[PDB]
Amino acid sequence: PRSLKKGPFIDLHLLKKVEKAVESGDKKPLRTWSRRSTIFPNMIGLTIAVHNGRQHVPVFVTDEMVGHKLGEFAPTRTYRGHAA
Amino acid sequence: NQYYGTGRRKSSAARVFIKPGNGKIVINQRSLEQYFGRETARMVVRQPLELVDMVEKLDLYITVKGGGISGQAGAIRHGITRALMEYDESLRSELRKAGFVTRDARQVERKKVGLRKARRRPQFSKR
Amino acid sequence: AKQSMKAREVKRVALADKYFAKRAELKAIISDVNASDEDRWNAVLKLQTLPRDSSPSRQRNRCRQTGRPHGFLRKFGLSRIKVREAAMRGEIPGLKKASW
Amino acid sequence: PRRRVIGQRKILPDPKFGSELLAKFVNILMVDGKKSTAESIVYSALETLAQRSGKSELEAFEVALENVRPTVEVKSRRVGGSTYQVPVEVRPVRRNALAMRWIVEAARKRGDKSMALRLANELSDAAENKGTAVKKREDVHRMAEANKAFAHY
Amino acid sequence: ARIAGINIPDHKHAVIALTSIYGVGKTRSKAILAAAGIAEDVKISELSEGQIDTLRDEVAKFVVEGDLRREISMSIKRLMDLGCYRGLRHRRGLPVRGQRTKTNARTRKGPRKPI
Amino acid sequence: GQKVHPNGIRLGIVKPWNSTWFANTKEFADNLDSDFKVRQYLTKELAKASVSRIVIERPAKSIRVTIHTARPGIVIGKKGEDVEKLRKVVADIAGVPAQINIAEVRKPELDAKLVADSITSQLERRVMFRRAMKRAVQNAMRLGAKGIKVEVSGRLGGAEIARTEWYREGRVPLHTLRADIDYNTSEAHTTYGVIGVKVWIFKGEI
Amino acid sequence: RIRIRLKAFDHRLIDQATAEIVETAKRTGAQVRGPIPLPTRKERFTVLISPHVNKDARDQYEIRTHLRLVDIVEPTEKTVDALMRLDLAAGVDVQISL
RNA sequence: AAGAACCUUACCUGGUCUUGACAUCCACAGAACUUUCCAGAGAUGGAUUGGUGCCUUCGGGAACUGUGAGACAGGUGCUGC
RNA sequence: CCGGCCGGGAACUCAAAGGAGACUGCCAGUGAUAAACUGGAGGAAGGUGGGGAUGACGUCAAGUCAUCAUGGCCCUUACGACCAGGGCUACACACGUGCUACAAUGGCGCAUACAAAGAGAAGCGACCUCGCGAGAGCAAGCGGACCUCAUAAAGUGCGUCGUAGUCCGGAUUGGAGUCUGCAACUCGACUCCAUGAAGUCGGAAUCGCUAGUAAUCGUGGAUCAGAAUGCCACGGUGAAUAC
Ligand SMILES: [Mg+2]
Ligand SMILES: [Mg+2]
Ligand SMILES: [Mg+2]
Ligand SMILES: [Mg+2]
Ligand SMILES: [Mg+2]
Ligand SMILES: [Mg+2]
Ligand SMILES: [Mg+2]
Ligand SMILES: [Mg+2]
Ligand SMILES: [Mg+2]
Ligand SMILES: [Mg+2]
Ligand SMILES: [Mg+2]
Ligand SMILES: [Mg+2]
Ligand SMILES: [Mg+2]
């Protein structure tokens, strides 16, 4: 994963959205594409619609997703099984 | 005076100097016994001397580069063979009949396009 | 290749040359180890704000006579097909068929 | 091939004993071109068998080979419907090659520990006609005897 | 011959025997033996009870056996109930570290199941 | 089957290089691109002059272009007003000072490039391809080439099935490397598609 | 000492070059140590020849950079200027060093 | 295919542009260039600090940019029968 | 200051140029007194010495309109263009081509010998310090027979394991990390700790190879920011067989 010297990676626009939404209280889900961004500690409670190629999958951020890429909770493939 | 020959094998080149003496053989500033681990290599080095029966009355100072253990051993053998050729010409017939003058012109065949090695083709299938 | 594809590559090269110095500086802050945490953080953010096309890794070598992105040869700047044609016509110095 | 082979490749006699027969044995036992390992294993087997028996290494090896060497084998001929297992007498070089190969197959398939131990035990059994090698020679001769009717060819 | 609550073989050398503890491989075994001052080639049934007690103390440093098992299980179950990509992969029993599933993946998917 | 390029297989043996400038890995790609641009510009602007060969050298931050042409008077013009403009544009393209030298080509009837260009021009002009090929072969064998082969391939004469026809006289031993096989190709963009012309001319040995 | 590095793509041409180098450096009065042949760099390339598939159909090309070394021990004052004004034929790169 | 994280990428979902990303030619405006702030996923749009020159029939052209209609440009679209 | 280290030497190995040699040349026999063949001498090479490049007329209206060019047709507020995300990496399955194995001709630990060929300037990166390791810091040297990549591995000497799904075997997975890159979730490589699977030689069937070849062991390069078990080369060890 990312080198620890570089610290964590958050995309600037998503950071701006998050800081303003958290300082201005519960708002609309953060419609965002930055799947590569890291879920920071002050992300809790925010509902974020992470892009997945065609949809913005809603993700309710909780404590235990801190340190994970938002794109991990929005799967990008559909699969139900062959010849069910 | 020192009599000199050059032997070659695979990719090994061996300079061999012979001068009458107590039968000391030096390979790259190192004795034969602890330079060659293979008894086959030692036999290969000593083959011309034993076949001409001059084993103890000559001293060998030899420096060889390139190749591996067996290639270097063959290079040594060729070096002694040529050194005794330019020592005396009388033992030439014996060494040829034995087969030591001939420089063994067999190198690793080049890898070729469309083959895994020199001749090992990729596995073929009709379908 | 397509004219649009060649145009994209030209734009990327131009942007990389234009913004090369700033990227060098910011990456120097990031990979410096005696730089403060605030410095490294702000450098990450500024390197984000720099356009992506500025990244020299974004470029793709293309055959300068056809724009083909595959089979490139850096020594000649051409794909395998163009290298073959020019070499046979003699338009490449010293080059000739090898056999060994 | 449809032409003819030149003379057989020259083989350097092995250093410890100077026997091209033993050189061929080492070559046949060799795997993945590791002649050093093959020679060490053969030499250990030879000294071990010499010590267990009493014979010289070379003569004991010759006895073990001779108890395994065939004289007539069977080859396939086509006439129709069925095949002829025609018995043909073997030339001595092929005799020695087959004896060595059968000995090595039996030794590899034996269930001991070190391959030198396996080879010494197999050659010792061949010294009194017990090994899988002498069993294979028994099978070859009795098959040729069964097919003896086709010998006239 | 009972370290971290499991029987370890007595016929094997100490390094090989200590690897039988779920949570100790060759490296941790060597570290344990060095820290307890025991030769690496000594057989378990030939150690003084003081030495086995010291070995118990050393192996107690690392998390092994049930504690390690439930640690791994809670990590896997957290992945599960988070339902991230790795949680979904773990649920479905498919490769989790980005391998190909067009072919192979037999270790995760189990042996062939004909249609 | 396919065949090796009669020029390429002989480059180091009995042929010269159409470019003999030395540069290292830093300069090779840029010099090749600039040579390509110069040759393309020269051929486009001298299509009429029948430029048989273009050799490029780069002595020292300079470019020297030898234009083996069949109408040196045409390519030079009055005094040097045409070659002066050509040199100016060549220098601008190459980014270095230029020097254009015109080379007399005697007998355009024994040069593969010029024969191919002539045949292609006739094909564009809709002359019978059999007549063009026979004319080329007769001209070369009268000028004295030890041999010639001409091949024309494509939708000949407005046909919908493309075919290949080739005439030959004398010897054209393509397998002998020391034989002087001057070979060259050209394309003719006719209203029914492209037609490819290939010319081999065997002029002698060592 | 003056060091001349001749790099060329053609051994005949580079031999001409080094011959006239030594002739000039000897007419100027200085003595020469060479020419010394340094190993040819044989840069090899392998390319598929069909525009589509056919992986086993390849050409192998080769560029042979020949290199010669010229030594000028006792560099005469006229020798230096003569060598630097000599102006070699095209197709040779000459590196001058002290 | 001598090497798909973005690029490549030609495909998909959306956000956008249509003389257009890339070419010539027409006119007008403007040196370019550099830096900075906002919004937007970014595209892109608002601005704007500085800049306002290189030759000169000194009035205009040479470049580089935008605009304004096009003649066109573009197509990894089909056909290797 | 035992290191060609320095003075030196031009012998030697090498480097690169130019020459010589191998031609059925000679001898014998066979042979239509011919071609030639069966041997022999000599010679490094003996019969087109080994290998490579070289692909004839033509066949499959074989492949490519996606390298390129191109006739004809078609799209053009678009089938063109720009952007961010996703996919090409999906998995009940089936096939091809490979890699690692199933062990003792081995595994592991310690010491140690022997290579060729290639690359390199926003590049190869010594030495030194730190880290268990990927690697990090300062940083010389070198567009190079100089410097770096870069200690070859198999091999040899000693010990250990003693036939066991095992110190074989390494898949899978958990945790912790390094580097590249704006960015490693989809989807990188690598490292440490841990886990340790299937596999005990594989049905019908089927492939490669007659020499330094097969087999086996490592090394380099192109592509490339990173990303080879592929591809292209290089050497080390090195057979059996052909009636
Ligand atoms: Mg293949
Ligand atoms: Mg195009
Ligand atoms: Mg790239
Ligand atoms: Mg992509
Ligand atoms: Mg066709
Ligand atoms: Mg077809
Ligand atoms: Mg031929
Ligand atoms: Mg098709
Ligand atoms: Mg694919
Ligand atoms: Mg293991
Ligand atoms: Mg590389
Ligand atoms: Mg790479
Ligand atoms: Mg090899």
Swiss-Prot record, chain A:
User: Subunit info?
Assistant: Part of the 30S ribosomal subunit. Binds S13 and L5 and cross-links to the A site tRNA.
Query: What's the protein here called?
Result: Small ribosomal subunit protein uS19
> Which GO molecular-function terms appear in the entry?
rRNA binding; structural constituent of ribosome; tRNA binding
Which biological process terms from the Gene Ontology are attached to this UniProt entry? Answer: cytoplasmic translation; ribosomal small subunit assembly
Name the HAMAP family on file.
Answer: Ribosomal_uS19
Coiled-coil region(s) at which residues?
Answer: none
**Per its UniProt record, what Pfam families does this chain match?**
Ribosomal_S19 (PF00203)
Described function: In the E.coli 70S ribosome in the initiation state it has been modeled to contact the 23S rRNA of the 50S subunit forming part of bridge B1a; this bridge is broken in the model with bound EF-G. The 23S rRNA contact site in bridge B1a is modeled to differ in different ribosomal states, contacting alternately S13 or S19. In the 3.5 angstroms resolved ribosome structures the contacts between L5, S13 and S19 bridge B1b are different, confirming the dynamic nature of this interaction. Bridge B1a is not visible in the crystallized ribosomes due to 23S rRNA disorder. Protein S19 forms a complex with S13 that binds strongly to the 16S ribosomal RNA. Contacts the A site tRNA.
- Which UniProt key words apply to this protein? Ribonucleoprotein, Ribosomal protein, RNA-binding, rRNA-binding, tRNA-binding
Name the PROSITE patterns for this protein: RIBOSOMAL_S19
> Which top-rank group of organisms is this from?
Bacteria
Alphabetized InterPro entries for the sequence: Ribosomal_uS19, Ribosomal_uS19_bac-type, Ribosomal_uS19_CS, Ribosomal_uS19_SF
Q: Which GO CC terms are listed, alphabetically?
A: cytoplasm; cytosol; cytosolic small ribosomal subunit
Q: Which gene encodes it?
A: rpsS
Per the record, the similarity remark reads:
Belongs to the universal ribosomal protein uS19 family.
From Swiss-Prot, chain B:
Q: Which Gene3D superfamilies does the record cross-reference, listed alphabetically?
A: 3.30.230.10
Matching InterPro entries? Ribosomal_Su5_D2-typ_SF (IPR020568), Ribosomal_uS9 (IPR000754), Ribosomal_uS9_bac/plastid (IPR023035), Ribosomal_uS9_CS (IPR020574), Ribsml_uS5_D2-typ_fold_subgr (IPR014721)
Extract the coiled-coil ranges from the record.
Answer: none
Give an example GO biological process: cytoplasmic translation
- UniProtKB keywords: Ribonucleoprotein, Ribosomal protein, RNA-binding, tRNA-binding
Query: What would you give as a GO molecular function for this chain, any one?
Result: RNA binding
This protein's source sits in the domain of life called Bacteria
List, alphabetically, the GO terms of the cellular component aspect: cytoplasm; cytosol; cytosolic small ribosomal subunit
One matching Pfam family, short form?
Ribosomal_S9
Q: What HAMAP family does the annotation carry?
A: Ribosomal_uS9_B
Q: Subunit structure, briefly?
A: Part of the 30S ribosomal subunit. Contacts 16S rRNA. Cross-links to the P site tRNA and weakly to the A site tRNA.
Which family would the database say this protein is a member of?
A: Belongs to the universal ribosomal protein uS9 family.
Q: What does this protein do?
A: The C-terminal tail plays a role in the affinity of the 30S P site for different tRNAs. Mutations that decrease this affinity are suppressed in the 70S ribosome.
Q: What is this protein called?
A: Small ribosomal subunit protein uS9
Q: Which organism is it from?
A: Escherichia coli (strain K12)
Query: Species lineage, top-down?
Result: Bacteria, Pseudomonadati, Pseudomonadota, Gammaproteobacteria, Enterobacterales
Name of the coding gene: rpsI
Swiss-Prot record, chain F:
Which key words are in the record?
A: Ribonucleoprotein, Ribosomal protein, RNA-binding, rRNA-binding
InterPro entries on file: KH_dom, KH_dom-like_a/b, KH_dom_type_2, KH_sf_prok-type, Ribosomal_S3_C_sf, Ribosomal_uS3_bac-typ, Ribosomal_uS3_C, Ribosomal_uS3_CS
Gene3D superfamilies according to UniProt:
3.30.300.20, Ribosomal protein S3, C-terminal domain (3.30.1140.32)
**Per the record, a Pfam family?**
KH_2
Q: Which CDD domains match?
A: KH-II_30S_S3 (cd02412)
Which GO molecular-function terms appear in the entry?
A: mRNA binding; rRNA binding; structural constituent of ribosome
- How is this protein annotated for GO cellular component? cytoplasm; cytosol; cytosolic small ribosomal subunit
Q: Which BP terms from GO are recorded?
A: cytoplasmic translation; ribosomal small subunit assembly
- What SMART domains does the record point to? KH (SM00322)
Q: Does the keyword rRNA-binding apply?
A: yes
Q: Where is the KH type-2 domain?
A: 38-106
Instruction: Show the PANTHER family listed in the entry.
Output: 30S/40S RIBOSOMAL PROTEIN S3, SMALL RIBOSOMAL SUBUNIT PROTEIN US3C
What is the documented function of this protein? Binds the lower part of the 30S subunit head. Binds mRNA in the 70S ribosome, positioning it for translation. Plays a role in mRNA unwinding by the ribosome, possibly by forming part of a processivity clamp.
Q: Member of which family?
A: Belongs to the universal ribosomal protein uS3 family.
Annotated HAMAP family: Ribosomal_uS3_B
What is annotated about its quaternary structure and interactions?
Part of the 30S ribosomal subunit. Forms a tight complex with proteins uS10 and uS14. With proteins uS4 and uS5 encircles the mRNA as it enters the ribosome, which may play a role in mRNA helicase processivity. Some nascent polypeptide chains are able to cross-link to this protein in situ. In collided ribosomes contacts ribosome rescue factor SmrB.
Q: What is this protein called?
A: Small ribosomal subunit protein uS3
* Species: Escherichia coli (strain K12)
Q: Which gene encodes it?
A: rpsC
From Swiss-Prot, chain G:
Annotated function: Involved in the binding of tRNA to the ribosomes. Part of the processive rRNA transcription and antitermination complex (rrnTAC). The complex forms an RNA-chaperone ring around the RNA exit tunnel of RNA polymerase (RNAP). It supports rapid transcription and antitermination of rRNA operons, cotranscriptional rRNA folding, and annealing of distal rRNA regions to allow correct ribosome biogenesis. In complex with NusB is involved in the regulation of ribosomal RNA (rRNA) biosynthesis by transcriptional antitermination.
**Which PANTHER family does this entry report, sorted A to Z?**
30S RIBOSOMAL PROTEIN S10 FAMILY MEMBER
Q: Domain of life of the organism in this record? A: Bacteria
Q: Which PROSITE patterns match?
A: RIBOSOMAL_S10
What is this protein identified as?
Small ribosomal subunit protein uS10
Q: Per its record, what are the GO molecular function terms?
A: structural constituent of ribosome; transcription antitermination factor activity, RNA binding; tRNA binding
Signal sequence, start to end = none
Single biological process term from Gene Ontology: ribosome biogenesis
Which family is this sequence assigned to? Belongs to the universal ribosomal protein uS10 family.
> What's in the keyword line of the UniProt record?
Ribonucleoprotein, Ribosomal protein, Ribosome biogenesis, RNA-binding, Transcription, Transcription antitermination, Transcription regulation
Cross-referenced Pfam families: Ribosomal_S10
SUPFAM superfamilies in the cross-refs = Ribosomal protein S10
- GO cellular component assignments: cytoplasm; cytosol; cytosolic small ribosomal subunit; small ribosomal subunit; transcription elongation factor complex
Entry's InterPro entries? Ribosomal_uS10, Ribosomal_uS10_CS, Ribosomal_uS10_dom, Ribosomal_uS10_dom_sf
Annotated S-S bridges: none
